Amino acid sequence: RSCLENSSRPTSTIWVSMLARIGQRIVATLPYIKQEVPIIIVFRALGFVSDRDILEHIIYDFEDPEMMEMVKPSLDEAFVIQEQNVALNFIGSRGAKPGVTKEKRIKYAKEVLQKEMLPHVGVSDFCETKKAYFLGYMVHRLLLAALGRRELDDRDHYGNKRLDLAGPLL
Amino acid sequence: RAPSTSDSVRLKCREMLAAALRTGDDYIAIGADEEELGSQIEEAIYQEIRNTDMKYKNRVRSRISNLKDAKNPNLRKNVLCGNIPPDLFARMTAEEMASDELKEMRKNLTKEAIREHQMAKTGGTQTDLFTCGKCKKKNCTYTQVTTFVVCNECGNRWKFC
Amino acid sequence: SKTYQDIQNTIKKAKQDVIEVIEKAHNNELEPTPGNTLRQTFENQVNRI
Amino acid sequence: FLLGQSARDAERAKDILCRLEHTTLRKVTANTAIYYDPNPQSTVVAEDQEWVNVSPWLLRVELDRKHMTDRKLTMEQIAEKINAGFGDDLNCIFNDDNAEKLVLRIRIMNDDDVFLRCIES
Amino acid sequence: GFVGIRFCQECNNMLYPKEDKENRILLYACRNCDYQQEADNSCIYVNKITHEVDELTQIIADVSQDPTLPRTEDHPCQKCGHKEAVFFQSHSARAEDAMRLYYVCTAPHCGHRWTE
Amino acid sequence: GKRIPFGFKHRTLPHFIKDDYGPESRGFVENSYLAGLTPTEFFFHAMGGR
Amino acid sequence: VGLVKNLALMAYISVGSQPSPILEFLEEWSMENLEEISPAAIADATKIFVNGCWVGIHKDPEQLMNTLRKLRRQMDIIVSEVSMIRDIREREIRIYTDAGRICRPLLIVEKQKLLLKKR
Numbered sequence: 001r002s003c004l005e006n007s008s009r010p011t012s013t014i015w016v017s018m019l020a021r022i023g024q025r026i027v028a029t030l031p032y033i034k035q036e037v038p039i040i041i042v043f044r045a046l047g048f049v050s051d052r053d054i055l056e057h058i059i060y061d062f063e064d065p066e067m068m069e070m071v072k073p074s075l076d077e078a079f080v081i082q083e084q085n086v087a088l089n090f091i092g093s094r095g096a097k098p099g100v101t102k103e104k105r106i107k108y109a110k111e112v113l114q115k116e117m118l119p120h121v122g123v124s125d126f127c128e129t130k131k132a133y134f135l136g137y138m139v140h141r142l143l144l145a146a147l148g149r150r151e152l153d154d155r156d157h158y159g160n161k162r163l164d165l166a167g168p169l170l
Numbered sequence: 171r172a173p174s175t176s177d178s179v180r181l182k183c184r185e186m187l188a189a190a191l192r193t194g195d196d197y198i199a200i201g202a203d204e205e206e207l208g209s210q211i212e213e214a215i216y217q218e219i220r221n222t223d224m225k226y227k228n229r230v231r232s233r234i235s236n237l238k239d240a241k242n243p244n245l246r247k248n249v250l251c252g253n254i255p256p257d258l259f260a261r262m263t264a265e266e267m268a269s270d271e272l273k274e275m276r277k278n279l280t281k282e283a284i285r286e287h288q289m290a291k292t293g294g295t296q297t298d299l300f301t302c303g304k305c306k307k308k309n310c311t312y313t314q315v316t317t318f319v320v321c322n323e324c325g326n327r328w329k330f331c
Numbered sequence: 332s333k334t335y336q337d338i339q340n341t342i343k344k345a346k347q348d349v350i351e352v353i354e355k356a357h358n359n360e361l362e363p364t365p366g367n368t369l370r371q372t373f374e375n376q377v378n379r380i
Numbered sequence: 381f382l383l384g385q386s387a388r389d390a391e392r393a394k395d396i397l398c399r400l401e402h403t404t405l406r407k408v409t410a411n412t413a414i415y416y417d418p419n420p421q422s423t424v425v426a427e428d429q430e431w432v433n434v435s436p437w438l439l440r441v442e443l444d445r446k447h448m449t450d451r452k453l454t455m456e457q458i459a460e461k462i463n464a465g466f467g468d469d470l471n472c473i474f475n476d477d478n479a480e481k482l483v484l485r486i487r488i489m490n491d492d493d494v495f496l497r498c499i500e501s
Numbered sequence: 502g503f504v505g506i507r508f509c510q511e512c513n514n515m516l517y518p519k520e521d522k523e524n525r526i527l528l529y530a531c532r533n534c535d536y537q538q539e540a541d542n543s544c545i546y547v548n549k550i551t552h553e554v555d556e557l558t559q560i561i562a563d564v565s566q567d568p569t570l571p572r573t574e575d576h577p578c579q580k581c582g583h584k585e586a587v588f589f590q591s592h593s594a595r596a597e598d599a600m601r602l603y604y605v606c607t608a609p610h611c612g613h614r615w616t617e
Numbered sequence: 618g619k620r621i622p623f624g625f626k627h628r629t630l631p632h633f634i635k636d637d638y639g640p641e642s643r644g645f646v647e648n649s650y651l652a653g654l655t656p657t658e659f660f661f662h663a664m665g666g667r
Numbered sequence: 668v669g670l671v672k673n674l675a676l677m678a679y680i681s682v683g684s685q686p687s688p689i690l691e692f693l694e695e696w697s698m699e700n701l702e703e704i705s706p707a708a709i710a711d712a713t714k715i716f717v718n719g720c721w722v723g724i725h726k727d728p729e730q731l732m733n734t735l736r737k738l739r740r741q742m743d744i745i746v747s748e749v750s751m752i753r754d755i756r757e758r759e760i761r762i763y764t765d766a767g768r769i770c771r772p773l774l775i776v777e778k779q780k781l782l783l784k785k786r
């Protein structure tokens with residue numbers, strides 16, 4: 001649940017889930033996007049054509065192949081997306097208000113990919129790097145949870161809760 | 171004496187069996203006819219199967235591997251010494267042909283699995299002071315919580331307040 | 332005033348027994364009870380004690 | 381409720397329990413590794429089991445021993461089932477019950493790279 | 502043994518395997534580029550059903566400086582031979598069935614780990 | 618139907634140390650209502666009542 | 668039952684602060700920023716998160732956390748409501764400064780002796 005700081009827009013949610021079941025195909029539920037999109041297409045849309053860069057942002061160490069076997073399926077799933085334009089078109093095609101043309105869809109995709117998702121890291125003109133690193137950290141945490149190396153996060157743990165006193169409520 | 175066969179597959183199987191039986195030179199020490207033993211084994215296999223299909227070839231290969239296994243030459247020595255008749259060896263299974271150590275390990279694993287498959291018995295203080303009304307016996311076990319009565323032999327379940 | 336002594340002795344004995352069970356589990360001696368895993372049988376033994 | 385003599389002794393009841401319990405490869409398999417071994421006799425791995433028995437790829441599905449003994453299985457029936465279930469399209473070269481490692485060798489004879497992944501899964 | 506991803510040289514992308522039908526060898530081609538390289542591992546995929554993972558490889562030397570972690574003096578280190586040492590369970594989900602400890606030396610410049 | 622879980626990271630409460638499966642560290646109340654209760658067992662008893 | 672709750676006599680909720688002084692104080696130290704950093708250098712390091720924002724990377728958590736604790740104890744640059752969490756198992760320093768973080772005051776115990784002396 002991302003939220004910059006008492007901003008006009010409401011808090012945005014980013015569900016980076018994974019199919020149970022090829023098997024082990026990671027997806028994402030971006031705001032204002034009814035369907036799901038794989039994380040690899042999102043990374044390419046943020047401005048990362050190279051695969052090595054995407055993996056480095058997601059996975060920090062390459063000496064553990066046991067972790068690499070989990071991302072290979074989803075990585076190879078989206079093999080027909082290399083350039084940034086096609087990724088932007090694919091992400092915008094699933095938008096709530098699909099533009100009748102191609103330019104409108106690209107603009108809508110760039111706006112949702114720079115203002116709606118993860119507004120707390122940054123919503124300025126050039127902040128794609130930090131957004132990509134945060135997304136890679138989310139994927140890394142998801143993979144660690146899947147491997148069981150790190151227990152899940154309890155929902156009732158007050159350490160992950162915040163109280164809204166009269167201030168924020170008003 | 172095993173009857174001769176004119177089938178090429180049978181002859182090849184007999185030759186392979188004889189060659190495998192010759193591993194380790196145990197035949198010379200025992201003075202047993204390796205060729206005759208191989209012919210008898212092939213004849214027993216052919217009688218059991220009655221066709222030179224894939225099953226017969228698989229059985230022949232398994233027998234050759236078991237007889238030529240360097241990890242348990244005792245089976246080969248016993249076969250060449252008459253301890254295991256050719257009919258028994260041909261009809262024997264993989265578990266029976268295993269070495270003594272392998273057989274002991276398999277038995278231990280099976281016993282451990284059988285024990286682990288069981289369920290823990292219900293705990294309780296067994297005593298003969300309560301007479302079960304469902305069987306007339308005195309053996310039973312009680313549990314205080316009201317004291318629940320559990321029959322030992324008959325299994326009468328009751329409680330006393 | 333004597334029942335208190337008996338209760339304290341029993342509690343200390345139970346504590347010693349559970350500590351010994353924990354030590355055995357740590358050093359890998361407590362074999363898994365049939366029908367249950369190692370943690371399950373450990374918890375069952377502790378609860379019974 | 382057991383009917384035969386198995387009702388009394390647990391030795392003859394464990395087999396009944398096993399046959400009534402669902403057992404699959406995952407329960408008995410320990411490791412599964414695919415290799416693109418070109419020549420069957422080359423045997424990139426050190427295993428003296430293919431030359432005695434005699435496509436440029438195979439699956440080395442080694443099974444566990446403790447689980448197999450617990451369920452009391454034999455490689456003969458496993459090979460028969462794995463060959464009949466998928467028709468006369470593969471050739472499983474099982475291993476004898478004397479070696480330490482319970483290795484296997486699945487090969488296909490007659491897009492092809494992912495076929496082995498799909499079938500093994 | 503395991504298998505690691507090997508990126509391309511020019512486009513830096515995932516290299517898919519390929520069985521050369523002509524020379525009868527194993528190659529790794531690129532989906533976009535036409536790069537090729539002769540393989541050396543002769544393996545493509547491995548699955549660990551038992552998931553026999555060595556917990557020691559996950560443990561780090563920084564665990565020693567933990568104020569909420571037990572310490573014992575009866576299990577000294579091996580290399581340096583210090584007395585103080587910590588101990589804890591796997592602390593990893595999906596624990597099959599084992600509370601086996603993983604002793605870690607409590608001293609700077611050592612970071613040794615062992616098990617008994 | 619089980620003992621007190623590990624709400625924190627591998628421990629019931631901050632007082633007890635990690636991997637402390639002892640009786641008093643998992644809910645076993647050693648004292649009695651006449652002789653008072655320890656705060657930790659007091660909290661665990663409150664959990665049971667809830 | 669169980670949904671309605673009441674605060675404790677000592678329980679106190681953080682009113683909220685700003686992250687700018689903390690960012691400046693962590694930026695002065697030898698902390699490489701996340702925008703310009705070798706990806707291979709993330710493994711043997713600790714990731715710093717402030718208000719859930721991943722920024723900067725450090726190479727000495729055992730000293731950084733001590734410096735932060737001393738600074739908060741002196742009440743000069745960081746208010747008493749801020750909280751620095753130290754994750755030992757995985758190297759991550761997640762700091763939070765937003766409001767709603769319920770907390771309470773606790774005495775400090777350096778080795779085996781408190782600081783609340785007779786003075």
Ligand SMILES: [Zn+2]
Nearest residue numbers: 509512531534
């Ligand atoms: Zn390439």
Ligand SMILES: [Zn+2]
Nearest residue numbers: 578581606611
């Ligand atoms: Zn040391």
